[PDB]
Amino acid sequence: FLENIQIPQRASYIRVIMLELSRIASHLLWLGPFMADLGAQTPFFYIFRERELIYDLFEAATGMRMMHNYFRIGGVA
Amino acid sequence: SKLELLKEVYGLISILPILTLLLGITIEVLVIVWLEREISASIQQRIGPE
16 A cells, blocks of 8 residues: 555455454454453353354455465455 | 170161262262253253263
């Protein structure tokens, strides 16, 4: 974004999908543990069962489990 | 004669039923911990202590 290697708007929308899924990746990994801190004793494993699908997504997208190396320089991986 | 005590040496008490209660309560402790570790962590989870 600094040296202006023009990122297409389609790849930009792909990155938007990424970012708005990471919003979920944060919402779960807070609320679940937040439920396990506030007093909600049972739903701990519940939110992990919900999150299981994001694991398959991050795996099949670019990387092993955290989707590592989904951002190259001239676009994405 | 009856110098100190004829029938009162040690033969008036039996410790069988007390030990049966001990065995029963220990077995029931096993049952209840099995109940816990197999129902609490298995409502929406995997099986307990397999």
